[PDB]
Homo-oligomer: A and B are copies of this chain.
Amino acid sequence: AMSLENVAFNVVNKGHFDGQQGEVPVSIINNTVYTKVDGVDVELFENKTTLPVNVAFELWAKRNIKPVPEVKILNNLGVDIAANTVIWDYKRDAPAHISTIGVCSMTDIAKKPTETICAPLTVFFDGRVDGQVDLFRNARNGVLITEGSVKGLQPSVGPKQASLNGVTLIGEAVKTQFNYYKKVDGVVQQLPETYFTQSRNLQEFKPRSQMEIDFLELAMDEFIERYKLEGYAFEHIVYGDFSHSQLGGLHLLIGLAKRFKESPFELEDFIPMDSTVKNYFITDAQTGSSKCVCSVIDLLLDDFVEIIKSQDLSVVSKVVKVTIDYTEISFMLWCKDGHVETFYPKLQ
């Protein structure tokens, strides 16, 4: 028996929806859900979504609390809907998907993914739940994650990191690295080779390789010498050029991280969502150098070096395409006399 008051009961007593019976008094004012605790109202939930406040409250309560793929991964794989769960998008404070399957009466399109209305949609299946590797088998379109091998299917090994209650982390007490599988029109796909973004914070940035350690601890000239990077324009692309009104380059998160230790800057996240490439309007506080659209990606520096060192440097400009987080990321590569001028995620 689904009810606003029982959803609130679960939130209050179990920290999320947990199928427990019970009711607490609830009041809804504008976009906020309150409950009464000893005669005073206590806020349980502020609706930041475009859904009705009580609907969004229920979907948030029923969010998946196990490590799940980051939304950018799901989006890049074309996932339209999840099977019997809600992937909560913590970057948008909203459900990652419009509709649900067997979750909520206001948003459900079906109780089970085997219903035909689900056949065209790419359904997310979680092999850690009994019976869902088998539902993927009968599913026309879908994406499946597992922790171990699936007899009859070659896996695509995903990123090391997953999202646990909006914290992106590499699990040590839980597994966050999944096998990925995908089916389009009943056919198991071969997922492409792909790099993975590292999903790190500017504030909490930690190197994950000796080259990244070398990048953070060495001066610019030393690092470029040690990894034989003359002519690839890391001065511009990675370190950043702060001498002109328009900030130069600075497209790799580790380069922002290094700069942030020395002097601060504003990153305006004008499309706040999870995505492989992030666009920021950045203002450098020390110099006043700024750029309206500064595309930023968090690649392992190692991976970025391999990408730029695997390009032909003999044309003035061209589009370079790189599979990242399973999607095709277009870069612009600009060269002159056989050296790199700039190289950036294309602003398209």
Taking Cβ atoms with an 8 Å cutoff, the residues of A that contact B are 1-6, 11-16, 18, 21, 23, 25-31, 34, 36-44, 48-50, 52-55, 65, 67, 75, 80, 89, 92, 94-98, 105-106, 116-117, 120, 164-167, 169-174, 176, 204, 242-245, 264, 266, 268, 270-273, 279, 281, 283-290, 292-293, 347-348
B29 and A53 within 8 A (CB): yes
A172-B287, A290-B164 known; A53+B28 contact, CB < 8 A: yes
Which residues of chain B are near A37, meaning CB under 8 Å? Answer: 271, 273
Which residues of chain B are near A284, meaning CB under 8 Å? Answer: 173
How many protomers of this protein does the assembly include? 5
Which residues of chain B are near A243, meaning CB under 8 Å? Answer: 173
Closest 8 pairs (CB-CB, A-B) = A3-B3, A27-B52, A171-B288, A15-B292, A25-B105, A174-B288, A15-B281, A173-B289
A15 and B293 within 8 A (CB): yes
> Which residue from chain B places its CB closest to the CB of A99 in the assembled complex?
B39
B171 and A268 within 8 A (CB): no
B165 and A266 within 8 A (CB): yes
A sample of 14 cross-chain residue pairs with beta-carbon separation below 8 angstroms, ordered by A number, consists of A3-B4, A15-B268, A25-B105, A27-B106, A34-B50, A40-B95, A40-B96, A40-B273, A120-B120, A165-B268, A169-B287, A171-B287, A172-B288, A173-B284
Which residues of chain B are near A264, meaning CB under 8 Å? Answer: 204
Which residue from B94, B105, B169, B289 sits with its C-beta under 8 Å from A40? B94
Cα separation A66 to B117 with both chains bound (whole Å): 32
B65 and A292 within 8 A (CB): yes
A164 CB to nearest B CB, Å: 5
A292 and B14 within 8 A (CB): yes
B164 and A15 within 8 A (CB): no
B272 and A42 within 8 A (CB): yes
Which residues of chain B are near A38, meaning CB under 8 Å? Answer: 75
A29 CB to nearest B CB, Å: 5
Cα separation A28 to B47 with both chains bound (whole Å): 12
A165 and B283 within 8 A (CB): yes
Cα separation A1 to B2 with both chains bound (whole Å): 10
A68 CB to nearest B CB, Å: 12
